[PDB]
Design a protein around this nucleic acid. Structure first.
Lengths: 178, 552, 398, 178
DNA sequence: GCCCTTTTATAGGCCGCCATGCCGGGCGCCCGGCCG
DNA sequence: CGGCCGGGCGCCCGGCATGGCGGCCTATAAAAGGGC
DNA sequence: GCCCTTTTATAGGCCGCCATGCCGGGCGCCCGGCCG
DNA sequence: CGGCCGGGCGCCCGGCATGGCGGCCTATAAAAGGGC
């Protein structure tokens, strides 16, 4: 079993249940940028907890960058408050975490070629294109990028226990190859 | 002594390349004959430019730099002399003869690789240019073998002997007389590797010693070499003949009078002093070992100091002498030195643990230094860093147990001469004698296991015997061998032989039988832990009062 | 004093991990290796340290026994030929088991060391001075070396700073001098603050300023702890530090008065001589300690500046490196005197054509002086500007 | 294919077709030793080609130590001549080589454990008892002793081509394991 | 088991050694005090 | 403040004789022929 | 395709640069000679 | 034998403009939500 993963990113979606005039948000908030040619949302930011919000005209927003579930929820609530202050009748509704990313560093290098050869059905490896082995796991639906340095990053999770289970499942395989 | 200290693929390539180059150079020299030193200068530059550089005391700091190529270029240059000299023409023998004064200094240098290469090259030169090279050796290498402070001098001058024997083989017969005494002395030298290679050299040389008395003189020997052979003959003649000289003394006007047995003792000490051998003056107490010891120490110091005025070599340096005594005898030692040898100067490193820093550097500036066993023990980590001329232990028996820390402390004292004063060199076990001789002459009686198997186990097994050849013969042979081995290095003289007024001593045992109560207690105890408690209980219950009452 | 407990309830996770790995080794690879049942009695289900765990609970000792003795026994019990088939996976499993055992033992050692350090801090706090201070100093120094937690390391630093003062007042000085020597040793362990001499012994006339992952953290945490200890010690002693403790003086000063008047042991250039490392270890302490000393010791460093400047003019590259660092610090803190020394006896030497060492050291001193002083260097740019302008077009590349 | 084996020992048997009084051979030939308690034969030796002969009372002898077939046959003929000179009516008959030993050194170390694991049917390895891997080959009937140093010795051959074939057969396996 | 030849080579057991003691008995050192 | 203080304890002494590491030394392995 | 966040990290192609020339024309050096 | 000898050839000059290594620089890879 051994060491535990450290979460690095959490993505949450929350519906404010009201239409927003994006340019009015951009012109009033210092911490907002709007470029309709590049992207259809205003990119707001706050410094506690450090997070970014893609707030769309339809009332949905995507809050990213948090390191914990409580931080993500609190940041989403703060963004809803900020939209409320600008005059819109935004209401915090429909919160749901939709991605968690983790990272871990087991203390030994990995023989990626042998791992790819043995577990070819569940992995892909093109070292000319990307220096990391890609591993897709069916039971917890987690995708792991495995690197020769002994560092693994897990993605696609919707709960912390999913990345924990994925690391527990993958650790014996990495032990076998050095 | 560095002589004592995919890769397999490269090992062959190196030697085949060196084989080819050496054959090429040999054929080149034979082609050119006498004129090789004229027609080809680049060879001369390669051979010679680091030889005149680094001479006259010169030493670039980059010569010690691992990343400077010249540190390799020096030895690469010095290899060519050995590689080429035996195949040169005799017309170039003057060239190598003129360069011998450079290679001898390369042998005296503090650089280890310099000494390695110089030993090799001098061995080769004495192989091929025999008379001149051996004149240089006997006149300007072997005198330096006895230098106490110059460790490099002794090391190089013993490695040159090692390689000279190994290369010359049978040709070394007329010259063993010069080399026998240095190796004999250096077998007991303070430094371990000098002792090892001197042991090998002596194993080779002693077999040839019986022939030296009649080897025909080589035709070309210089007058200095004939004189050297004659004086070495007279030097060795006293060692290998029971005849002996009148003892060594310095007749100072204030010098004390010596008794007859003291005269014999100083004679024995002088015999040891000449040939660099060490002993134990294991006389009975009350015969005045202090007078003999200070006499020989003062005579040696006087002789060295006088010789330092007739010469300028670093052989003599007015080195200090050390004496290790129990605390009670320091006053007696100082009084005897002052009253019998005034011209000596004395120092007492016996102060408080802080006081000693007031005379830390005075150790190197006074003729005689006195210290205690325990003061030396607690401060050995600083006393080891000094060299001494004489190292005297006044009560040897303190250092009989090898595991005791006092022995480990005292055996680190690098001294040119080394002597133990005692009364009982062997008290309980011969391993005490081994421990003492490990301080005096290391390796002389072998390692611990060697001495164990040779002597100690038979000696212990001889404790219970009934004239049975199974164990009596083993013990008898062990004592005879240990007697012969250590005979010249002990000088026991009984108090009965010296003192003209000491009444005889008589001994009687008083026998009695144990009392009823104690007898019953012991008989009960037979049914009744540790082994030692039984012996202690037997000692206690053994307690005679009627015997003492009647005896008084 | 008394031996520590064999286990802690916090490490039941580690012991359970060991149990699972050992069970894998016993079971799965002997099923693969075709060894009949009864190969070994089952491991104890309850691990040591848990509540209601019997005296025969599974322990690390059982893990060692199975990974050595039962491993050999089971190997001998395997049928010939099948052993050849099975053995490599058995070796892999054995090595994994040994790794987990080592992890558990290391965790136990860390917890024991932390508890011992806290107890020692408590004992020193209430002014206890044992006649036989064997284990107390050991625990405290272990918590100065291997303490990843900054707060507990600072607490142990204060503990040593108070222990030295208490022993100085008591009059006994053996252990006091020993711990001062050990602190000065640990302060110089970090490579980035004092390099390993055996590596740089072969480099000459190169600017050092222009030139395994696990150990990098250990060195810097140990140096952090030692430096905090030394700072608190100096703040405690105030003016009298140069009087109370002389062992620090010897460590700082003996290679400085040595090598004076052009003195140079040949062994100073020897990679295998320890004094080549001891020189830089000594010269690091001046930088490490001078900014936190009392102003009463400013005359001491001022009197030693003539040694540091000569070290800056010396042909030894590390001498110039350390002298540049130390001069930068001294001019930072002893400002007027150090800058007087710099302008009067370093900058004049910057123009020497033949003495490359003089120019090299005298430019590296300026580099580090600017880097450390920052905004404080404003009044002296008038002194510093012309040498740098001249040396931008110097023959030497660095 | 690569390098070629070097033959190290050849054992040959030749029948002299006549009874011999062994102690009379021992008492007359300097180069003969006889110890009836230890062994029943006289051990004669000759120095060109260097070989030893175990000469028995029944007339058979075993000639060993030769590095080539011609040398073995010539040594056997010389031994027959030596027996003839001692008075016995010995005649050279029934020569037949019965063992050839070879040795070779491929230039890489060998992973003995993996080789033993894969080829367990044809190999034995007890490193506590003997450092070399034993290998028994069915087709040429050669037994090879393989060592981690990269050195192989072949034995049991009755022709040179047998050890050559055995080395050719075994070389790919040793290439596979380092 | 017994022997001859040959190239390869290293790790278990067997016979030893070797430091273990532990009660009084003493000496010497430094490490704590104080005395007029 | 200088100088003698007691004071503790580490070091060494010595016995017998037991148990735990030792280095070193065959034996290990392969073919084969012969005779005992 | 387009964008936000996050830890991991390295090797193919694309746009450049960069030494390639090779005929006469000259200078300077050392490398072979000989001259009275 | 000393001193001036010719004598060869390596070095540098200069043009335009083509082909073969370059370093460096995104793009590569993973999840996901939203809208365009």
């Amino acid at each position: 079993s051994g060491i535990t993963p450290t979460l690095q990113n959490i993505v949450a979606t929350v519906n404010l249940d009201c239409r927003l005039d994006l340019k009015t948000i951009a012109l009033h908030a210092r911490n907002a940028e709007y470029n309709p040619k590049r992207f259809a949302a205003v990119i707001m930011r706050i410094r506690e907890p450090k997070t970014t919000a893609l707030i769309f005209a339809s009332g949905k927003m995507v809050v990213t960058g948090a390191k914990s579930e409580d931080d993500s929820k609190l940041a989403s609530r703060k963004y809803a408050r900020i939209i409320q202050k600008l005059g819109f009748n935004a209401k915090f509704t429909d919160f749901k975490i939709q991605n968690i990313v983790g990272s871990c560093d087991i203390k030994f290098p990995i023989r990626l070629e042998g791992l790819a050869s043995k577990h070819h059905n569940f992995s892909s490896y093109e070292p000319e294109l990307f220096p990391g082995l890609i591993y897709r796991m069916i039971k917890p639906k987690i995708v792991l990028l495995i690197f020769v340095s002994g560092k693994i990053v897990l993605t696609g999770a919707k709960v912390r226990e999913e990345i924990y289970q994925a690391f527990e499942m993958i650790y014996p395989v990495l032990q076998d190859f050095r | 002594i560095l002589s004592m200290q995919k890769y397999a693929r490269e090992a062959k390539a190196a030697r085949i390349t060196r084989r080819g180059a050496k054959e090429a150079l040999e054929i080149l020299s034979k082609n050119f004959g006498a004129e090789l030193l004229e027609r080809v200068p680049t060879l001369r530059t390669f051979m010679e430019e680091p030889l005149v550089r680094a001479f006259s005391g010169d030493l670039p700091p980059e010569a010690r730099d691992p990343e400077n190529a010249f540190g390799q270029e020096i030895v690469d240059a010095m290899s060519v002399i050995r590689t080429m000299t035996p195949t040169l023409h005799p017309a170039l023998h003057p060239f190598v003869m003129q360069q011998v004064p450079l290679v001898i200094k390369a042998l005296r240098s503090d650089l280890s690789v310099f000494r390695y290469m110089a030993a090799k090259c001098m061995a080769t030169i004495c192989s091929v240019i025999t008379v001149d090279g051996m004149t240089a050796l006997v006149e300007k290498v072997l005198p330096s073998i006895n230098n106490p402070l110059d460790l490099s001098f002794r090391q190089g001058a013993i490695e040159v002997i090692y390689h000279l024997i190994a290369v010359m083989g049978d040709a070394i017969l007329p010259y063993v007389i010069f080399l026998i005494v240095p190796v004999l002395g250096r077998m007991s030298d303070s430094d371990n590797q000098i002792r090892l290679i001197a042991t090998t050299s002596f194993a080779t040389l002693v077999k040839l010693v019986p022939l030296e008395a009649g080897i025909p003189d080589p035709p070309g020997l210089s007058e200095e070499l004939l004189k050297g052979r004659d004086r070495e003959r007279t030097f060795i003649a006293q060692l290998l003949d029971p005849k002996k000289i009148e003892p060594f003394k310095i007749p100072v006007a204030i010098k004390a009078e010596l008794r007859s047995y003291q005269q014999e003792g100083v004679n024995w000490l002088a015999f040891l002093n000449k040939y660099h051998l060490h002993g134990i003056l294991c006389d009975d107490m009350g015969l005045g070992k202090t007078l003999q010891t200070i006499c020989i120490v003062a005579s040696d110091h006087h002789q060295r100091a006088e010789e330092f005025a007739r010469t300028g070599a670093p052989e003599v340096r007015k080195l200090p002498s050390l004496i290790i005594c129990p605390p009670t005898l320091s006053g007696h030692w100082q009084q005897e030195i002052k009253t019998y040898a005034p011209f000596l100067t004395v120092t007492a490193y016996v102060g408080s643990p802080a006081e000693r820093r007031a005379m830390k550097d005075s150790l190197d500036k006074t003729d005689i230094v006195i210290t205690s066993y325990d003061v030396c023990r607690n401060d050995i980590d600083v006393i080891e860093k000094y060299n001494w001329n004489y190292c005297v232990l006044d009560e040897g028996h303190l250092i009989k147990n090898p595991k005791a820390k006092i022995t480990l402390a005292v055996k680190r004292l690098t001294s040119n001469h080394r002597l133990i004063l005692t009364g009982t060199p062997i008290q309980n076990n011969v391993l005490e004698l081994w421990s003492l001789f490990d301080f005096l002459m290391p390796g002389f009686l072998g390692a611990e296991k060697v001495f164990l198997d040779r002597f100690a186990k038979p000696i212990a097994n001889s404790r219970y015997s009934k004239a049975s050849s199974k164990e009596q013969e083993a013990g008898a042979l062990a004592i005879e061998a240990l007697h012969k081995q250590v005979l010249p290095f002990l000088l026991r003289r009984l108090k009965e032989e010296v003192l003209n007024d000491l009444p005889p001593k008589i001994l009687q045992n008083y026998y009695c039988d144990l009392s009823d109560l104690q007898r019953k207690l012991f008989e009960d105890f037979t049914k009744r832990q540790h082994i030692f408690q039984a012996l202690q209980y037997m000692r206690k219950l053994c307690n005679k009062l009627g015997a003492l009452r009647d005896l008084l | 004093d008394l031996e520590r407990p064999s286990h802690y309830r916090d490490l039941v996770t580690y012991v359970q991990r060991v149990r699972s790995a050992s069970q894998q080794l016993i079971n799965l690879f002997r099923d693969h290796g075709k060894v009949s049942q009864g190969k070994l009695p089952t491991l104890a289900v309850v691990v040591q340290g848990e509540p209601e765990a019997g005296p025969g609970a599974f322990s690390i000792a059982n893990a060692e026994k199975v990974v050595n003795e039962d491993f050999e026994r089971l190997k001998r019990l395997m049928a010939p030929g099948q052993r050849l088939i099975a053995l490599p996976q058995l070796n892999e499993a054995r090595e994994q088991t040994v790794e987990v055992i080592e992890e558990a033992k290391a965790a136990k050692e860390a917890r024991d060391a932390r508890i011992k350090a806290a107890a020692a801090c408590a004992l020193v706090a209430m002014k206890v001075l044992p006649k036989k201070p064997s284990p107390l100093i050991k625990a405290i120094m272990d918590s100065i070396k291997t303490e990843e937690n900054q707060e507990l390391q600072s607490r142990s630093a204060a503990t040593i700073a108070r222990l030295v003062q208490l022993f100085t007042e008591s009059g006994r000085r053996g252990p006091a001098e020993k711990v001062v020597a050990n602190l000065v040793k640990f302060s110089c362990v970090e490579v980035a603050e004092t390099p390993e001499f055996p590596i740089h012994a072969h480099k000459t006339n190169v600017i050092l300023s222009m030139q395994y992952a696990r150990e990098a953290k250990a060195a810097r945490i140990t140096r952090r702890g030692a430096k905090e200890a030394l700072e608190i010690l100096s703040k405690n002693f105030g003016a009298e530090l140069l009087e109370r403790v002389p062992t620090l003086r010897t460590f700082m000063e003996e290679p400085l008065v040595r090598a004076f008047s052009g003195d140079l042991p040949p062994e100073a250039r020897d990679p295998e001589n320890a004094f080549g490392q001891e020189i830089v270890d000594a010269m690091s302490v001046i930088r490490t300690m001078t900014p936190t000393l009392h102003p009463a010791l400013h005359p001491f460093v001022m009197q030693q500046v003539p040694l540091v400047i000569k070290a800056l003019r010396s042909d030894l590259s590390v001498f110039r490196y350390m002298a540049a660092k130390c001069m930068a610090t001294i001019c930072s803190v002893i400002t007027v005197d150090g800058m007087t020394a710099l302008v009067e006896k370093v900058l004049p030497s910057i123009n020497n054509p033949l003495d490359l060492s003089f120019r090299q050291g005298a430019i590296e001193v300026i580099y580090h002086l600017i880097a450390v002083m920052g905004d404080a260097i404003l009044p002296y740019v008038i002194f510093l500007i012309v040498p740098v302008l001249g040396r931008m077009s110097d023959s030497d590349n660095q």
